[PDB]
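INPUT
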Amino acid sequence: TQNPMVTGTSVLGVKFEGGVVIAADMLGSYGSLARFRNISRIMRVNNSTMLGASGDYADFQYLKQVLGQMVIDEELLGDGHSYSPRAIHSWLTRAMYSRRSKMNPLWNTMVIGGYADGESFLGYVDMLGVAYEAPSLATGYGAYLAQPLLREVLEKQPVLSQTEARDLVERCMRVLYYRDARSYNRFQIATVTEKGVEIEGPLSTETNWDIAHM
Amino acid sequence: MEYLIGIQGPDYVLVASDRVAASNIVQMKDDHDKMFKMSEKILLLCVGEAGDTVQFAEYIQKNVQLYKMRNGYELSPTAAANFTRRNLADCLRSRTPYHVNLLLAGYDEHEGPALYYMDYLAALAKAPFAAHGYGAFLTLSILDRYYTPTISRERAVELLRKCLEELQKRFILNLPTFSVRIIDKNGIHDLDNISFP
Amino acid sequence: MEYLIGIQGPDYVLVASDRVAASNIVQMKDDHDKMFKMSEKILLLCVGEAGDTVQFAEYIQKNVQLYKMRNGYELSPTAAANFTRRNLADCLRSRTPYHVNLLLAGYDEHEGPALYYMDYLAALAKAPFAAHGYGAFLTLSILDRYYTPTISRERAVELLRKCLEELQKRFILNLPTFSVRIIDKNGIHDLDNISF
Amino acid sequence: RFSPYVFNGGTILAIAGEDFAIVASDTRLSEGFSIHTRDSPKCYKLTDKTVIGCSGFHGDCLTLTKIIEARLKMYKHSNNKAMTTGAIAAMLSTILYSRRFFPYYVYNIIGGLDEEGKGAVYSFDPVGSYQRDSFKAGGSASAMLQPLLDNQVGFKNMQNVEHVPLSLDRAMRLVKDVFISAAERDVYTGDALRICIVTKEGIREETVSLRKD
Amino acid sequence: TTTLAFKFQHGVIAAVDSRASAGSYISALRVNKVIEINPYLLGTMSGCAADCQYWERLLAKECRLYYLRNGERISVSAASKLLSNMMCQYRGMGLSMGSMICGWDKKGPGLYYVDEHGTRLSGNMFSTGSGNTYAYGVMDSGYRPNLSPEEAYDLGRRAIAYATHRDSYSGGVVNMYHMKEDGWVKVESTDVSDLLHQYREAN
Amino acid sequence: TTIMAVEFDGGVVMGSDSRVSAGEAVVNRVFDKLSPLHERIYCALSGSAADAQAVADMAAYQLELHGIELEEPPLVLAAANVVRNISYKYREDLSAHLMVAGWDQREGGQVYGTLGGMLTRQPFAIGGSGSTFIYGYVDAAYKPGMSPEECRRFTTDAIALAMSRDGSSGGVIYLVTITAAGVDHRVILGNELPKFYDE
Amino acid sequence: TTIMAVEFDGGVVMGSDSRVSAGEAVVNRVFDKLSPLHERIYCALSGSAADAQAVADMAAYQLELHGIELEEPPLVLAAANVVRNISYKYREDLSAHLMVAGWDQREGGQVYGTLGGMLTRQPFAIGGSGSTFIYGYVDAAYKPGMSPEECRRFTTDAIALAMSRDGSSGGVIYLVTITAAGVDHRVILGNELPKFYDE
Amino acid sequence: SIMSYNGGAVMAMKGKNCVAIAADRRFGIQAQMVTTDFQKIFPMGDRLYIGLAGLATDVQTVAQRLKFRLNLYELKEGRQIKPYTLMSMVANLLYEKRFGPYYTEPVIAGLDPKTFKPFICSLDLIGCPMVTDDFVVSGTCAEQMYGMCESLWEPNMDPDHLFETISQAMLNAVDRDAVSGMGVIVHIIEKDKITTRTLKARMD
Amino acid sequence: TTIAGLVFQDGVILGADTRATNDSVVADKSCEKIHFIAPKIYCCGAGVAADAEMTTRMVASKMELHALSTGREPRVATVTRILRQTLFRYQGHVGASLIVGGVDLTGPQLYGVHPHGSYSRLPFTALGSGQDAALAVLEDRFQPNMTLEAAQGLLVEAVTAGILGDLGSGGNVDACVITKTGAKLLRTLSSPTERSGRYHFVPGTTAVLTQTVKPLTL
Ligand SMILES: *[B]([O])([O])[C]([C][C]([C])[C])[N]C(=O)C1=[C]N([C][C][N]C(=O)C2=C(O[C])C(O[C])=C(O[C])[C]=[C]2)N=N1
Ligand SMILES: *[B]([O])([O])[C]([C][C]([C])[C])[N]C(=O)C1=[C]N([C][C][N]C(=O)C2=C(O[C])C(O[C])=C(O[C])[C]=[C]2)N=N1
Ligand SMILES: *[B]([O])([O])[C]([C][C]([C])[C])[N]C(=O)C1=[C]N([C][C][N]C(=O)C2=C(O[C])C(O[C])=C(O[C])[C]=[C]2)N=N1
Ligand code: NA
Ligand code: NA
Ligand code: NA
Ligand code: NA
Ligand code: NA
Ligand code: NA
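OUTPUT
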């Protein structure tokens, strides 16, 4: 994809005690036009791992199709071996770089949440194959708005609980709804823990417009 | 930038090339030779872009030599010229187009002397006289003035002198010395290099 | 394309310009003079775009001559050079920018000999020696080799010969003949044109 | 239009002593005017006697490190021995030049131990021109650090100064102070300072803090 | 960059500067711009560093491979021809490469300017790189065919030094070799700025 | 941006959104786009904010003095022509659309468009980026002879429908109702927007 | 172009306009844009006509043989994926949007969009140039649990509203109603289009 | 680039009751060096000097046009100009060409003629002042000069310590730049005296 | 650059960082971006540093002229109008992004003014390269009628989020509280981030060719 059509905006992410949580609004924007206001930009990869995607939805849906089949292909063998959160993140770095290096990139910026062997994984990958780990992540315009607020809290308290992390993420998506033009007030939160991958939604943030009387 | 000239006679062909191998603003060699021996009775004079001239000329040279070894007789100037044209015409609409301007002077035993002309497009033209480079714009009208079909070789060198002296007088590029060669019945003959003060 | 050179001495300034007036591929004149008499003890050597050189040089010449008539004394080489710089600097950011490269060689009675350098941008630089054109790329290192501050004028012409002979050997443009002039206490002095 | 490169930044540095080799870097990864992450060190361990610093576009860094890791094994499988520091640096040239017409945008500095035991640094450009050095800076703050390294390690523009070789004590302190100075003046240098020290005993890693703005 | 080479009575001099330069910034003060293919064959370097290094190392590979196959050392004509063919196959690709191949063979002392375009010129004297022109000036002025070994070294040393004085993209150290009938000898790795300070103090 | 003016018996309703965009960034989520030109004349600002404000300031200045010179309130046709002539004269330079509306003793409630220096009186008009998405709705839902309340409903419904679809439109709905009696300003918040299908 | 598909209990309604434009010129004012893929699967053609037909031909060919290989009618999810994969693979090269809809024994009446190689099931979807102008109307006027007749009314109203505003859309409204019972084709003429405000 | 056509390098620095200012001596045109004694630092009083890098014609023009205004100020006012005032005069002079600017990045260094406290600043091409308590740089080797200055600078340095700091900072920076060098010049501004020195720098 | 503003109960607070960047190199560590306009009107400088400098200078002079003539403390609406109509004539080429804050006759007032000549009256705003981090902090924790203590804390937290988050922004938080009774300019209100050094060269290590000494004698 040289020119993307139906883009999704910011995907958030943050580690907590015994798990990881990610959030992403359910909007596919056709430029300025909010075309598709009910589409899931988050994906259950396997029991250990989940994947949220900014950028072009057709390229994300291709990656969803390819990953889904890889996880199916793995689960056929049933030999006590699974793709870890790091392993999917490693593959996806090599996928985007290979497509970048053929000058036919998948126009996406993605966040990979996961929990396995006691440890929390949160991993960034973009269209060019730039990848890393961090205690929080925010793709797209959320890098400039939301990531400041996550690093503010994580300076004062490095290790959060699930409720601390969830109520923080709800506070972030409120700021994105106000300040990001390409966002919407329908979103999904997706947590991962020992239990597995939950995908809760559709949700909304309670807004406030009292500053309009000043 | 470089300069070639050919003058066909009744039973011979006079030719001459400059000897500057230029680079940017510098005259790297004053003694450079731009003529390539195809056969005993054929010279290919070649000018153009730096690496293109020698690579093209030598590819032709070796295939003309291959024709000699294969069959026990050399190509005629007509055959050699159309062979040169066929290669340059096929490269024209391809990945590696050779930007080369060239004269093929020769002597056939049956057909007599022949001077051929060819631009980088690979249009072949038989001519009584011709010239390549920016120097041709000054010197071609001198050949129109003083050339006749029955010109003697000793006079044809004095005609050549007037062209080469006009380059020293009017052409902005240096070109101090020139290679000179005649082809006839008895093959290729070197002559004194027309140097100046 | 054209070529200038200046060599300052202890009590003099040698200068030289080529004599080709070129057009497209043709050498229209072999005898062209590129030096302009500003004062009795000043030469402006000028090179560049075809019409720009003479129009600029002559505008300066006449204003230097106007300074003589107005005040009963000529401009110094320092004054003349900064005047040349002031005009070229003001034209730089305007409708009519003159693309001219130039040397101003002169002799003051108090300050002694002086050779100035100036590109089309109008950066003025006093130099013991300098040169303009593509020929300067070949010849400047010959001046670095053999120049000393105490060079005699007869030796300085033999130094000039080595620069001009290097242009015949290596520079792709013709440039067969060169104008040559010395300035000192006794004003401007013509010298034999270095032909080949 | 689609641009396949992007500048992630960061600084790298290597010094070759008589019995050691420092290879250090910052930990900031950037894009535009935002910070991607503060824990992305540019030092990568290859063998027990060799380490490489890689800065520039991070997509190429990850790939090129993974290529070198893959090639190290392929050599060891063929030849039944680890690659020498000089042999890695020679191999890296061919990998960088194999992408001459679509560059690995990666400023590489290898540092480690040659077969004679001593320190050996090899500095690079993106398309694979290299040389052995005593010292070299690279990446974002290359220009800031290099002339100070020329001064203090090379003894350049100094007289009545005895040309004593670099102790590992002195070189470690120099690497701290230069990366402090880079962090102040470079936006793309900051957060923390990875320093890998290669001696015959092995590799050991320190982590001094830097400016987090 | 500034490289030079000239033949004289006692074989062939080959002198190069050492500056590398990404833009106005000096990438490296001391880069070795001569490759030693064998004891009887050198190669100067100018233009793109990676092109110069790769392609002249590949020449050396093939020259080494020629020795093993034929059981005799490669000629200077054949080696210069082989590099120009590598450049001919990569014409129009934006390779920048400006070598001179110096050596000694059965044919005598040999010197060849080889170029990125495919150019391949046999000649007595050559110079390449950005400082090309400034090197020629000093070299041509003080040249004789009948120089002594020491006077030849003085010419090559000065010519690179005065080129680096004028050319921004040349500097560092002069690296001068000397070719003979019994192979090359490294003459000196002299610093240029110390030589320019020395010539200033002589006046 | 989404703006809308509506005409009725003895007055006009006039509505905007509140989003000032800078590409994907929202610079101001609570910008009043209904600027007063006179005591009973407003204009709905759209396009370039710098251009739109400067015209509104210059129109306000011109209409203030024009009003005092007549010893009367200015006509809405006069204020529409003041905005028209500025927009027309500098049409290459400016990139804004000022929809003008108000009330007169003479011609009553009236709505004018000034898109690129033109002038046209309409019963309703719409403008800005979000007006694109609601041309179907306003054609469907408009019928003549609406009350003040029916117009305020219709203006809220249309601008809310646009705010849902247009990225450049959003925030709150600002409303102005101009009559002989006066000017009724009102702010419909993002909390209490009328819900439609949004999936 | 304006296209529209709508979903209900035991079937789908599917509608288009009929204008093939070439800039300001109308090449064909009576083009049926509802092409059959199978006996109970249609697609609504949009964007480039040459691209849109070629995909429909290739999808029809693929789905014909796929249907015979299963010994059953193809699923609408299958036909939606056949159109998706073609549109995705040649997304740079093609410039068309094929909205696919039909009926199954399994999942019943269903509507899919394939905009630039994506796939999404919606209760209704709209596409082409004229869909821009009616996003407000379809958000306003859609409510769930509509009959066949309520859907045919809604599809006619929306496409007529778009045809009024969009220059590239026009002519007649072609309608297709797909159920278990079969396929009901119907042509609402330009004479008998539903009138709204158009001044 | 425009600034790098002629290139150059200028630096200024603070010590205890003194200021230093220094610059390279190269005038060149792209690759070619022309002369090795080109003035980039100009006096604006007894204990106040201005250094000008970048485009050489504008280095000279801005120097001359600033001296024009300086001499008018000193005659009108009846005093030597204060250092902070000269900064604002340059800022005014450069911002007058806001949309057609002189391609030079000035660096001022002087002592206050009443109190003799150190002052330094630099301005961009459009005349935005930047006062510091440490150092200021301008040229094609700004990055190189910053890295030396940041590491080598210490507070409260005596005249001899300041000279060694600023000289080594210049010399090593200009030695990693192709279009800066061919000598360095350094002025040590003290209360009692001005000590101008030229260094044994690299000439390549 | 991260600049920001905030309206509270008794007044207005204006915030700004101290880093000035030349391309991607830190030119200045400590500079004041909060400029004086009037006694109870200050302005934050962002965008082109010269245009931010000279416009705020120019309007300050205009307000001094206006206040001296009127004999009254100037209105904050007046500075916004003057800036706008200056900035609008230059069509955004004078690239001064400005946050204008103050108190007058009609209460505390905060205006965002963009370089093309658009403006916005607001209760909170942010501008410069790290505006988004600061504006995200304000949206998260702003309420109407803050205390003097809470506003300082919030506005410091906003400018700090830019300082860390934005590569352009850095250094200390300058601030300016403008209550009814004057204006408190809290310069270096915070310092988010905290060496060995010492490269003592011996006198004589630098080689010297020329030496000239000009004595001055007062
Ligand atoms: B020598 O040629 O300087 C040297 C010789 C090697 C064997 C070490 N080569 C290099 O230093 C070198 C340079 N580069 C690429 C960088 N190119 C440029 O910066 C550049 C320059 O500046 C020199 C210029 O000149 C203004 C232009 O304009 C034509 C284009 C690019 N790789 N290795
Ligand atoms: B509304 O019309 O959106 C609104 C109305 C005002 C009266 C408040 N205006 C603005 O929000 C606004 C936007 N801008 C400048 C920013 N320009 C653009 O967003 C813009 C862009 O960029 C996305 C583009 O294409 C990139 C175009 O098309 C050429 C036009 C405008 N100032 N005020
Ligand atoms: B419908 O999408 O309009 C319709 C649907 C088909 C299935 C029949 N398609 C067409 O009418 C159509 C048009 N073209 C090629 C010609 N296209 C253009 O000229 C064109 C135009 O002009 C209308 C415009 O708008 C100005 C754009 O801008 C986006 C691009 C191309 N083939 N089939
Ligand atoms: Na930093
Ligand atoms: Na920062
Ligand atoms: Na919206
Ligand atoms: Na229509
Ligand atoms: Na230098
Ligand atoms: Na040099």
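end of record. The helical segments of chain C are 50-71, 77-92, 135-146, 153-170.
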